[PDB]
Write a protein that binds this ligand. Structure first.
Ligand SMILES: COc1ccc(CNc2nc(N(CCO)CCO)nc3c2ncn3C(C)C)cc1
Length: 272
């Protein structure tokens, strides 16, 4: 800590308080998060990708672990709130979706999962880049149904489900499944995608928190769920939201989806 001057608190991430800070020697401006774990965290220092927020240093000292990250100037939640009157332009949505899928394809190839993707953890800069941060009231809005049903050994698919939920929210300007308890989160999912059964998700009825007494709701039409997203966007979103984690599209396969045939990298309008 003595090598860093706090400039301001910018957040309380899940694992602790985050400060913007300046390195007293390097002059570098960084984000400092103050929080088996040593060895895992050290392995993250190697997982470098242009769409992953760089972890610069891990400082263990005195019952405190500090993590020093590259600093970005805005998060997607704030940008979404800033762009709510007009909406984020489709080409920028597609570019951010495509970049995030590149980040996930990289992490998943190294068998690292995020598990807690949410707009506040997706960070943007003036050049049109978006990056995944801060790998794992707690928000449930992005949690995959297998996690909600008590699967202990869930997979990379959970991150595809969270990113699908964020893709829908960029497009409609409303959270897709804004649950305020675990059951309300699961029932919001069922009310929109249909209560899952053995046909669409083999094994579902033997999940730890599955109850036969769950209400059975009909699936709704996607054209009702994300207007005015085009047929290619809806097709991709449907594959990122399949109930069975084994049928859910991978990040690698999503990158090849026809929705990205015309992807580009627009500059966002950022007011810092
Ligand atoms: C004037 O206040 C602000 C507020 C937010 C930002 C946006 N930059 C960053 N925001 C956040 N978080 C706050 C989310 O709003 C925590 C994410 O878990 N973590 C970062 C940032 N840059 C690097 N890191 C690492 C710790 C990952 C800038 C300035």
């Amino acid at each position: 800590m003595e090598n860093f001057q706090k400039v301001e608190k910018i957040g309380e991430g899940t694992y602790g308080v985050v400060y913007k800070a300046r390195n007293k020697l390097t002059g570098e401006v960084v984000a400092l998060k103050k929080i088996t774990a040593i060895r895992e965290i050290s392995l993250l220092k190697e997982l470098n990708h242009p769409n992953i927020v760089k972890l610069l240093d891990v400082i263990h000292t005195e019952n405190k672990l500090y993590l020093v990250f590259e600093f970005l100037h805005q998060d997607l939640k704030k940008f979404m709130d800033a762009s709510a009157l007009t909406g984020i332009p489709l080409p920028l949505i597609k570019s951010y979706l495509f970049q995030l899928l590149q980040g996930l394809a990289f992490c998943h190839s190294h068998r690292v999962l995020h598990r807690d993707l949410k707009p506040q953890n997706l960070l943007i800069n003036t050049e049109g880049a978006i990056k995944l941060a801060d790998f794992g009231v707690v928000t449930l809005w992005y949690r995959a149904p297998e996690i909600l049903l008590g699967c202990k050994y869930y997979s990379t698919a959970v991150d595809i489900w969270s990113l699908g939920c964020i893709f829908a929210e960029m497009v409609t300007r409303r959270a897709l499944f804004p649950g305020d308890s675990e059951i309300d989160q699961l029932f919001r999912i069922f009310r929109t995608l249909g209560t899952p059964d053995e046909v669409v998700w083999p094994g579902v009825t033997s999940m730890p928190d599955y109850k036969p007494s769950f209400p059975k709701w009909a699936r709704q039409d996607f054209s009702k769920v994300v207007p005015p997203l085009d047929e290619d966007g809806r097709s991709l979103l449907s594959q990122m939201l399949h109930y069975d984690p084994n049928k859910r599209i991978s990040a690698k396969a999503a990158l090849a989806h026809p929705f990205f045939q015309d992807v580009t990298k627009p500059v966002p309008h950022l007011r810092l």
